[PDB]
Each structure stands twice: as C-alpha cells, then as structure tokens.
Amino acid sequence: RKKNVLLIVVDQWRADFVPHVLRADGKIDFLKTPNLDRLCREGVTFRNHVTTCVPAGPARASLLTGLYLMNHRAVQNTVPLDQRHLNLGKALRGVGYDPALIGYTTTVPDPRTTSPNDPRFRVLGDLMDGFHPVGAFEPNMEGYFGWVAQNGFDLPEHRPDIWLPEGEDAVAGATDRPSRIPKEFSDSTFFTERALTYLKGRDGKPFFLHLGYYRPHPPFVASAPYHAMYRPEDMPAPIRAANPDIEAAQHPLMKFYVDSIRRGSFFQGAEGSGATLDEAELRQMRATYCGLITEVDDCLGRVFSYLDETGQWDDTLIIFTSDHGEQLGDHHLLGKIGYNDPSFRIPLVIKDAGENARAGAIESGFTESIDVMPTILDWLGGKIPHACDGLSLLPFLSEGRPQDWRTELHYEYDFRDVYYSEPQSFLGLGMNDCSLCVIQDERYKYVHFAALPPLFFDLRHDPNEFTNLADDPAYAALVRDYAQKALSWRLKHADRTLTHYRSGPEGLSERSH
Amino acid sequence: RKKNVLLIVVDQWRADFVPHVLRADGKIDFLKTPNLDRLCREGVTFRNHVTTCVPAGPARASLLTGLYLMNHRAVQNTVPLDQRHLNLGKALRGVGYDPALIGYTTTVPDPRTTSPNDPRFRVLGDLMDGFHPVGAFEPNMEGYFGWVAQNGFDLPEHRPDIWLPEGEDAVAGATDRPSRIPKEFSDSTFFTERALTYLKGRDGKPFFLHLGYYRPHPPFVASAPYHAMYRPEDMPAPIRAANPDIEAAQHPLMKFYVDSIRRGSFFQGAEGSGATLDEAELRQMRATYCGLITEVDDCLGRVFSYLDETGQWDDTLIIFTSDHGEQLGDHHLLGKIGYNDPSFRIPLVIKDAGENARAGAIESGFTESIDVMPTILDWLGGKIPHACDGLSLLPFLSEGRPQDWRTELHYEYDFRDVYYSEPQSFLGLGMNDCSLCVIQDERYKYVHFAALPPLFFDLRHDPNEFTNLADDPAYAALVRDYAQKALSWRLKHADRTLTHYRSGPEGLSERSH
Amino acid sequence: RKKNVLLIVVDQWRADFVPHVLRADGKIDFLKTPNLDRLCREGVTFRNHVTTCVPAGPARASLLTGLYLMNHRAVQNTVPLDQRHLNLGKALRGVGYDPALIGYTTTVPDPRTTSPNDPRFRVLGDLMDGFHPVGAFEPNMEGYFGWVAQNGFDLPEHRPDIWLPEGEDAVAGATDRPSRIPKEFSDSTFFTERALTYLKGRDGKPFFLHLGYYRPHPPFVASAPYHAMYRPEDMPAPIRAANPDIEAAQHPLMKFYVDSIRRGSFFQGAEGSGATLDEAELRQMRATYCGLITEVDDCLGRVFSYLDETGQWDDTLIIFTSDHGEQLGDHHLLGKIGYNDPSFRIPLVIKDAGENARAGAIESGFTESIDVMPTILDWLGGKIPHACDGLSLLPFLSEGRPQDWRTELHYEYDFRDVYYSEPQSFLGLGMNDCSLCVIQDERYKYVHFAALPPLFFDLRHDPNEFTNLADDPAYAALVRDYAQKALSWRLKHADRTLTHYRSGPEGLSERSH
Numbered sequence A, B, C: 001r002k003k004n005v006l007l008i009v010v011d012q013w014r015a016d017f018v019p020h021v022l023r024a025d026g027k028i029d030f031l032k033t034p035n036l037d038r039l040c041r042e043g044v045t046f047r048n049h050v051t052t053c054v055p056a057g058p059a060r061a062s063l064l065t066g067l068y069l070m071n072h073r074a075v076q077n078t079v080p081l082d083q084r085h086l087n088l089g090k091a092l093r094g095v096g097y098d099p100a101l102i103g104y105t106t107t108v109p110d111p112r113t114t115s116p117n118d119p120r121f122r123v124l125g126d127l128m129d130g131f132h133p134v135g136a137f138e139p140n141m142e143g144y145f146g147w148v149a150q151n152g153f154d155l156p157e158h159r160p161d162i163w164l165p166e167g168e169d170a171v172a173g174a175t176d177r178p179s180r181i182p183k184e185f186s187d188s189t190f191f192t193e194r195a196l197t198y199l200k201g202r203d204g205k206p207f208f209l210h211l212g213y214y215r216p217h218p219p220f221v222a223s224a225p226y227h228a229m230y231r232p233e234d235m236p237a238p239i240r241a242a243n244p245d246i247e248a249a250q251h252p253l254m255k256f257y258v259d260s261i262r263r264g265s266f267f268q269g270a271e272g273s274g275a276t277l278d279e280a281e282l283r284q285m286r287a288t289y290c291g292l293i294t295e296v297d298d299c300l301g302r303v304f305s306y307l308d309e310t311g312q313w314d315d316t317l318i319i320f321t322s323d324h325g326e327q328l329g330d331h332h333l334l335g336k337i338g339y340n341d342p343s344f345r346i347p348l349v350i351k352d353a354g355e356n357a358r359a360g361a362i363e364s365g366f367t368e369s370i371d372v373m374p375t376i377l378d379w380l381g382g383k384i385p386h387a388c389d390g391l392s393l394l395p396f397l398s399e400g401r402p403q404d405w406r407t408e409l410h411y412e413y414d415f416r417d418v419y420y421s422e423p424q425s426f427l428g429l430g431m432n433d434c435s436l437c438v439i440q441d442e443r444y445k446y447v448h449f450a451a452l453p454p455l456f457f458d459l460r461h462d463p464n465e466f467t468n469l470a471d472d473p474a475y476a477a478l479v480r481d482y483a484q485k486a487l488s489w490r491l492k493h494a495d496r497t498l499t500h501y502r503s504g505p506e507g508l509s510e511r512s513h
C-alpha cells in the first residue's frame, strides 16, 4: 500500500559494464557488482538504453525534465536551464511526495530569476530549483570535503590532491596505486551515509529519493583495496583506429577531441594527451574504473540492507541508471563527447514493487533517459506532463514492449564554446551551428551535423563505427531514409506546452488525442 | 579584506536572560553564558531590541525580509509568505554571497508557486525559498532524528518521547530529571556539527552563515548534566497577578490564553493547564530553561574556537539574536503570544570585524528585528532594498544612535484561527479583525487592538503591565498621543515596492529623497 | 435574463452639484441634469459617497481595484500601479464579460513588466492593463484630437488652444466667452460617439462598458451655448477664509496649495494664482463648470435613448459616479488636493435592472469608491476577490444599509513630489512621510498626517472645516477616539492576498470566516 521510489543515478558508467548483460551474451563478466546483479535478477534490465545528450548538465536536464535537448535547451555544461520547464522535483510535489535528492544536478540557474552576481554562476552548475537537498556534493564538492574534515581527516592544501596516487614518488596518470583518501572517507561512502540518514529520518513513511553517486566519474583513482581489485590483463581491450591521425580523419569533431583531450581531466595532476595513452595504461585505467564501480555496488548493498531490514524492499520501485557513458579509450577518446555509442549507452534496471512479472528479463526495446521521469510519475499515480518527450516504461514491466513503441534510438550533442573547451574556431562555426543529432536501430546509425558532414554506419559489418558510408552513392537511399526518420522525429517533438488548448464557440477546451 | 557574516538565531530566548545586561544593572547573573559574554565584551549589546511579531513564522519572516508584519503578511504560523517579498537569501546572492542556512525558517510556501498537494503544506512551515540549506532541522525534525539514528542511538516509536523525563516512573511536566537523549546527540549538538562541517568545507573562503538553534524552545527538558545545572531557588520569580481570573480580567485576549494554554505544549507528554503551575514548578521550569541556554552557549564556544584557530574571528561580523521571547510563567502565560514585553523583547549583540570602537557598550536606542537584514547588507556593501521597513544598525557600532533614529518600539500580533489555536469564536471576531499593534518608549506602552479594547500602561509605576489606564479619562491626552504616534507609524510604513518611481517628460525616473 | 453593466465615470464632478439631493434638502437646484435626474428617480442616490483618494491616477486605481491607496500604492499621478493587484478588467473576464472601456485610467505601468524606454513612462499615465479600449482619450488626448482632425476641423498649432476663449482679444482665465471648439466636436461628443459605436456593435449581446467622460475636468471653458447657459449670480458662493493668509495658517499643506496653485492649470493660457480670484471670477468659473456638466448630461441622454429604443434599459445596471471632486474656489483652492470634503465627496447613483425596490431613495449610509468594483462583480454573479477593501452595495438596493455597515468614511492623500508639484522642500519632509488619512462621520472629522500636525473639526458647528480643534485640550478624548478608530481601520485593512490560506495536517486549506 505504501509506495517508495529509489532513483539511483551513478555518473559515467557504461552500459557494457553491466554483468547481467555480459553473462547473457556468453561474455566474461570481468567485474563484480552483486547488488546490481540482485536488481537484475528481481527486475527488468534494459539493454538498449541511452542518455539523450551529454555531459552531466544536459544529461541531467533530460533525465529530470523528460525533455530532449532540442526542448530543454540546457545544451552544455555552464548553459542555463530555462525555469519554464517542469522538472521531476516540482512534479513530485504535485503527487504529494517530497523530492529528496542526494548528489548533484549541475544546473545553471535561469538569469531572469536571480541576480547576475549569484555565486551559482561561478560554477559548472548547482542544485536544480524544486528539489529538497539532503546530501549535496555542493559546488567544488564542498559538502563532501567538509564532511571529510569534520570526520577528522587532514586534507591537503589543494583538496583534490587526495586523488593523487599514494606516495610522493608517484607519477600522475593511470596508476596501480591507491588514492590518498581511505575508503571510509570516500565520496561513495559520503553519499551512502546521507542516504542512510535520510531513510532513517523517514522512519517508514513513503519516500522518493534520488540517490546520486559521483563514481565512476574520474579521476580514475580508487581507495584501497579497490585500486588493486582488478588485473589490467582481464579488462576488455579499447577499440580504436590504427593511430590518432587515422582516427581523426573520420570527421572534424573527432579530430578536435582526439587533439584536445588532456590526461589531466581524467587523472589528478596528470600531463599529456589522452590519445597517446598506450594499451597497458588504458587497461590499468579500465581496471581502476571497475574498482570504482565495485565500490559503488558495495555501497548500494548497505542501502539495500536497510530497506531489507525495515521491510521496505517490496514496497519500493528501484530504478538504477547513469547520467551518461564514457569512451574509456575507445576511438582514442576519454570522456563523454561526440557521437559514439559508448558515450551515450547507459545501464537501466527497474525493479517494481512485489514479485516482478518479468523478473530477470533483458529488454531490447529502445529506451531513452527522457522515459524515466514519466515512468516515476505514472507509477505514483500522477498524470505525465503534456510537455514531456518521453513515455512511461511501466508497460515493459508487465506485458512488454508496446506495439507502437519507438523503433529508433535518438540522442543529441551540442559542442558550442564553453570556458574549458572551445571548438568553434577550429571548426569554423558559429555558436548556433555547433550541434548534431543521432538516430539508430539494430542495423544502421546516422549522425547528422547541423553544419559539418554527416556520418552513416552499417552496425552489422562495422559495429564500432570506423567506416563512414554517408558519402557513398550506393547508400543514398539508406541515408535518405534515416535523414527522413530523424526529420520526422524533429517535427513530432516540437514544444508541447500549450498545443493541446483550443478556443472555440464553447470556450476554452483541451484536445486529448 | 575578507568579510564573513555569522548570524546566530536562537529560539525563544528572553532579553532579560543576558548576563552582560544583568551585571550592568547590578543584578545577579543567575545563568552562565561565557561565550555570549565574550561577544558582549568585544561588541555592542542592544538592551531595547524587539521582534516585530511572534511566533516563529511571523518573527522569521520579519527577520529575513526586513518587513513589519503589516507588510510581509505571514501573520501566523501556517499562513503563506507571499513570494513577492525580497528575502535575505536572495539579497545575499545579489552581493555574491552564498546564503547558507542551518536550522529552520518555518515558512509556508506561496500557493501560487506550487501544487496544492505540496508536502510543505502539511507542516507548520518549511525552508524559505532562496536559502542554501546546509543543516536543516527539516519538518517534523526529520533531519535531526535521522542524524541521531545514524549515530547509532535507538529512538522510541514516537520520536519526541526522547524528551520525556528519564525513568518510566517520571511524571511529565516541569522536572528535575534529565531527558532521555544524551548530550552528544542533542539538537544543539546537531546544529553545531552542521556549522563546523560547513565552515570546514569553506576552508577560509568568505561566508555568510545563518546558524539557527532550536533551544531554548520547549520542551523544557535538558540532557544531563544541564537538567541539574541551576537550582530553582536561584531563578527570578515569575511575575503574575493574584490568580488566573484576576489576570484574565485585564483583556479578552489575556483570558483566552490564560484559559487555553496547555502544559503539554511546553513539557513532553504533560497534562493540565499552564496557568495552574505553582511557583516551585515555574522555578524548576526556569532552571531547566537556563540549562538549555547554557548548552547553546557551550556549543557556540565550539564554533567560536574554530573561527579563532583559523584566524577568522576578526574578519567576521557576528550577530547574536533570538526570533522571539517567552512568557516563562509571567502573567500566568507560557509561550510567545499576546502583547507583554517578555514575548517580544529579545537579545541582540553585534561584534564588528577587528577591534570594535564601542566594545562592551550597552545601547539603549530602540532597535527592531527588521533592522538586522539592512545591517547585514549594508555591511557587505550592498544597497538596502527600497521595500525594507528597518534601517542599518551600523551607525551604532561607530558613532552611536543617529539623531533621527526612531523614538518608539513597535510590534504586532495577529491571533486569527489556526489549526491548533482558534480564539475567534471566544472573542467574537472575524479573521481580518484579529490583530493588535504595540508602541512604547521608556515611559508608556500603548496596545491597540483592531476590534477589542485598547490597553495603556505607565511603565515607571507599572513596569509589569498590570494596570490598564486606557479607559481612565485623566489619561485621555496621553492615550491620544500614543494612538497618534502609532497611526503615523502606519502611514509611514505603507508598502514601498514601486513608490520611488516616476513617469514624466524625460521618461522613467526614480526619486531618492 | 441578459445582464448589462454601464459604469459612467465622469471627472471632477462634486457631490453637491447633484440636483436630486439639492431638491431633497429644499435648496435651489441651480443646474440642469435631466438625464442624471432620471437615474435618481429610478434608482438609489448615495449622498455620502467619497473617493478614497485623489487625483485621477490614485482615484481610478481605487475605483478599478476595490483597494484603498494604503494597499494599491499608486499614491500619486506618475507613480506606477503594481501589476499584482487584480483589477476590474481582469475580474470581468473571470465572469465572461469583455471589459470594454471608453475614456482613460491614467495608469503608470509596473516597471518590472516593460522596458524603461516604454513611451507610457513619458505621460501622466496610460490605459490600465486588462481593459479592452474602444474609445481612448489616449495620452496627450491624441485619440480625441485625431477624431477632431478627421472630422475636418482645423486645429491650432498647439492643440489645447482650442480651449482659449473665443476671440483674439480674449483674456485667458474665467470667461463669459465660448471655447474655440464647436459642440459637435467637443470631447463629450467624442466619448458619446464611441459609446454609441460600441453599443451598436454589440447588437444586443450582453455588455460591460466603462463610459468615461473628461468633463467637467478643466479647462473651465465650454462650447457654445453651454458657456452662457448659467448666470454667475445664480451660482453657490465659494466658501473661504477672510484672506489667503488666514486660510493658509490652518496647516502647512493648506499653505503650500494656497501659495502654489496657478490659474493656468484651470483655464487655458491663464496667468496668476488661483487664490487671488475674486468672487465674480469664481462665480463665472462655477457657471462654466455647470455648463460643462449639462453638456455631459445632454450626451448621456443620447446613450440612454439608444438603450431605450433597443429595449435594454431594464436589463442594464447603471452606475453613475465621478473619480473625485473639485474645490472650485473653496478654501482658496482649485483642484482636487488636500483634505477638504469638496475634493473627495462625489456623486453615486445606481439603477438596478427592472423596477427598483428603492426607486428615488436617497441613502445616507457611508459609501466609498472601493465599493463599486465589488458591487459590479456581485451583480454579475462573480465572487468578490479576497483582496478587495470594499464591499458590495447590492444590499442598499433592496433592504437597505446592512446592520454591520461601516460607521465612518475614510480617505487618503499622498503629496510626495511629482514633476509638476513638489511640496517636500517647503514642508521639510522625505518622500515616505508625505501622506494623510481622514476619518469622519455625521459629527466629527479627523485628519491625521504622517509627519505634520493633525486636524479635527466639529462638523455641526463648523461644517466648512475652518476651526481646527485637534490641539484643544478639551477635545483630547474625542481626538483620541477618532485616532483610535483610524488606527483600527489600518489594522483591519492590511493586505489580504494570501491571509486566508492555511497549512496543516490535512494539507492546504482556506478559512472563510
């Protein structure tokens, strides 16, 4: 009768680092996530889920509004989110739920709503208006660092230097050494302690909780013993072209990122380019990444154990997802940028209340992060806002993929200049011409740029997106077809704020179909 | 060069429980507050400071907007605060400061800004829009209780029963026994730990912090050994009429509260009326109240010690105040209600940065809680909003009371029906007729009711407000004079949102004088 | 079954220039208004009606919001009206009526809603947001002058020179000559033609129409033959002190206006002070004023005739009123300023649909211009907005004055500096200290200034307000009593926007009593 929602949002966790799917495909599950595996056994694992944009700001705007980037317009980190969009926090209040949130949303405020001197305009983003923060990372991670200091741990003068490899002789970069922060004071421990505090405060009352984890976001360094938990040789090999120049030749945007991404954005204090990492260094980076993932899973076990002991597990809808993926060396790239699958494909696992009709199933239907907000509101008995682009995933938990479900995946990326990454001059583009959209299915992937060449991949023969076919005249009809599907997608998703209203002889009315 | 502001807001702490003033008047300082005494030695103590309204919701609306109740209209607990009023949190963002807040504001949201199903409409109030919460009590004190539970302390099924006197044989009410919560898990310890966490996270960067404490708000029970720290016989005697009926005869509103106030609103689980407490029980209640005060002072010492060790004390403006006072048995009343001095008189101590020109001085100028927000913004170099009713107190820290400073104190009280206290039927009044305002100086006090008889007191001969003179024809000219001052006060404080703007032949302009 | 509302708002028309009341008191009705007399015979004439403030901007804000100046804050001409106040136009849309308006409202826009370069900030005011204009005077009377020019009449280079007395030898000032504009092109003819156009466009459909007339607002010059219609010797004598200095001695605000008012504000092109007009000139001015009044009445006859011929008269609520009064030489003043009765007392005549239960009655109950908006909305079946200060007058049309009706009249005046009248330096006052309020009944009148001496008049012995008694110690109790009534009035009318809402255990609720 009581209904809780636990929305777990990790950061930078790839869809192909989900053991349940690896085992289903007969692959070696090279990492351990027993608590995520529990959700998979009890619920539905969605194997074709994408975030509709990257990096964190855009991806979290889509997750928390149910809108594509084409509508929310929070197109990059540092770009404001218009206050007109209804977010999940405000919608939760509409159904009587407190929108409690741990972690962060990386939201720049609307300048029309606050002073231009607002300190929230000094950072990548701050908490989205409408949520109730009960465990904030805070900008500059001040919430975490203050908790570390209050726990009695002496921090270095530059606090992110806790993420340098242990030892004054250590070389910054991919490392086999632990970080300089003990496990009991890690950021994953922090968010977990906030979750337990909040759940204990609720004392059995119905809850919504957005439980955000920073890891496995970089720096790719882990508290002991997670730094040594996986052997580099057991990791999947990175997938990349023969050298960075051949890789970059595919497209100007690929060249910009191959040339510009720096190791220091991924390892604390590191020097050099991301593209020059060798296979051994990429394998070590992947092993450390897996260590950070297992630490999150260990922490989730503590949260799940509290739900078990208080008898709330079977009353709670649990949704596990990530904001976006990570290239992890694929295509000579680090991070979440561009158009490749690994930046956008993300885990999604949903466990309904009670015994799940499809417990253990793996769903191939094409799902998008914009679907999560409608799913939560549907489940709590609210109406889905008219403006949302996504649709509720609840049918997948009972009977399966609806007959009229989408037949392609869609995502977008905007690469206009921000303070730390400025491709416009290299690309020769103005700020409103720096975007792309992607449409794909089981067979083909089409990447359309507003003002650069398009790309087209045959995923059966070229699953790793190495061979652009868009300019091959033998593919003209196929490229036409996918450009046409994407164009229809644009038309179908124009803003829906008031378009159901009608004047007329009987006064104001609303159309429902 | 760096400037910090620490605004300490305690709850329910009377102005006559401030040792520095007691000693200056040659009275016994019957309670210990060495850390407040430090602020008094280093700064200016304002001995005639009032909150402009009670209880917490109205008083905090005035404190955090600089507006009288006549303008903010958050007239009682449970009544919404209109979003149009500029609050201190939003004003702080206007000067580049993060408006960090610990404690609570007891603010009901504006219904035009949120769903009517919003859970914030189930409680007395929630956090005021525009602040950055870093240590929230939360509604139902969930933040505190979750922190207690996470600290490993087993709570009773009804969590406020931690405030029953220790021992299953204990009788609820005024008590010589400790509460059932250890000192290390008290609510004052909680807010202090949040303050230290926040200050350690700041790591020397400029800060604003609203450090709110719940104590000495009831229940009047204290963790050991604060419950035994003061002897009842050493406490000041309550000041009240010969019996509750003679007290109630003064005015219908006095009768309503004398008849209706229940001991259970002041001692956990207690039965009976507040007015029937005997002198010994009132003395014990006062001794417990002093214990709660000293616990807060002990906690402030920990905050001050961190500022001392980090070298920030001399960079920080420290303002110590209370939201409102407490009758503490005076006039047979418990709580913060009506029109008597003890409900509205509150401490105010201000320590400027560096060596204070008036260190140790006690100021008799008439100050009001609406002055605190203008003071903070003036000190940080911002403009004081046009709409504020209060004025900056900074002149008092250097040269003294301005020549044109106010010559009377003013406050208001609205007693329209709320869910837990409904005087309208007894008084025979409609909801918009249930208010009073008060004006007073060193000699006379005038209490004007919208729709009940007025009251007038000669404070030299009748300092404790026992003898109404308003209906004595020999006082007609004096009562006229004070009604006239109060009427002028109303006219001078009509809303100022746009009244400085002018159209005219040169276009839109603003008048400054 | 169909219901229409015709709200006729003239400008600057005194309550003692209403023939129906003059005849009832056995006085000579020295002016002719047969069409107003028809309304009086068929409806209720309110003989104690006041505008709650002057001049046009403030008075029309009160009329069109139902709010006292203390709440609407449009305190003078040129001062913005806050958009938060619900006006009659928007309320009419709430009941399905088009808020058609002819004339003007003299409303300065809220600067938060429009560019500071908006041309509406160059003028005294423009149309209030929310009305549907169907016959606007326009700023600078451009709508009227364009209609004159399109009618083929050649205008002078400075268009207001149509109001110079006829003849190049004419001396500007009070005159026995006609204006230089024919009757068929007068401003009263213009507004009437707009009214007939609008009513003919409606073609029998239900209507609301605000029919505004500029006259008898100055310049006090009339089209032929209205300039010669009344003999100066038949006019009521102006009521004033022995000389302007003795008049001015009563109060600093009286001195400011006696000294500063110029004849050119009342007669086109005239030179000299208003206070030095002799009795003959004041008599001629009064005769011209009566001529302008009869012209309006003639025009109303044309509107009434259209309602008669289309069978709509008995379906229409007709309300006749003025924005404010006019000193007309009383107390050496011209215009609508200060505190005297003639500036604030105004006509009010209401004819219900069908046969009126109180046809011909004269009502002595104290009514205020804030009552008109609630009356209209009540009559159309809408709810009266919570925020309104006024109350519906409908009970007066059936059974009579409610038992709990107000027992005093109230009005306000704010005299802070505007571009054409700047008393602050002479008075020594700041901008927020330049107001007064007035309370009066059949016996006594009390004028309270925010920051200047008060005034008190015994209206039985001193009906024309010549003898201030406020400083007479024998009146201390009476002055006390009236200051107390006014103070209660302030408390009872604090803003009511959200004060009926309540949070509580059952969620958001509203109190109705």
Ligand SMILES: O=P(O)(O)c1ccccc1
Pocket (backbone or CB within 6 Å): A011, A055, A056, A057, A077, A104, A106, A124, A217
């Ligand atoms: O966009 P990101 O995932 O790098 C991010 C940004 C700010 C805080 C946390 C994560």
Ligand SMILES: O=P(O)(O)c1ccccc1
Pocket (backbone or CB within 6 Å): B011, B055, B056, B057, B077, B104, B106, B124, B217
């Ligand atoms: O008005 P109060 O001081 O009793 C109050 C209300 C809610 C929370 C804290 C204090």
Ligand SMILES: O=P(O)(O)c1ccccc1
Pocket (backbone or CB within 6 Å): C011, C055, C056, C057, C077, C104, C106, C124, C217
């Ligand atoms: O205030 P007023 O009645 O002189 C006025 C102002 C502008 C247009 C019409 C009337």
Ligand SMILES: [Mn+2]
Pocket (backbone or CB within 6 Å): A011, A012, A055, A056, A217, A323, A324
């Ligand atoms: Mn991210």
Ligand SMILES: [Mn+2]
Pocket (backbone or CB within 6 Å): B011, B012, B055, B056, B217, B323, B324
């Ligand atoms: Mn309080």
Ligand SMILES: [Mn+2]
Pocket (backbone or CB within 6 Å): C011, C012, C055, C056, C217, C323, C324
């Ligand atoms: Mn006017």
Ligand code: NA
Pocket (backbone or CB within 6 Å): A420
């Ligand atoms: Na960055």
Ligand code: NA
Pocket (backbone or CB within 6 Å): A468
């Ligand atoms: Na190619």
Ligand code: NA
Pocket (backbone or CB within 6 Å): A480, A481, A484
């Ligand atoms: Na096609």
Ligand code: NA
Pocket (backbone or CB within 6 Å): B420
């Ligand atoms: Na309560």
Ligand code: NA
Pocket (backbone or CB within 6 Å): B468
């Ligand atoms: Na008495």
Ligand code: NA
Pocket (backbone or CB within 6 Å): B480, B481, B484
């Ligand atoms: Na006086």
Ligand code: NA
Pocket (backbone or CB within 6 Å): C420
């Ligand atoms: Na003018």
Ligand code: NA
Pocket (backbone or CB within 6 Å): C468
């Ligand atoms: Na006199």
Ligand code: NA
Pocket (backbone or CB within 6 Å): C480, C481, C484
């Ligand atoms: Na009285």
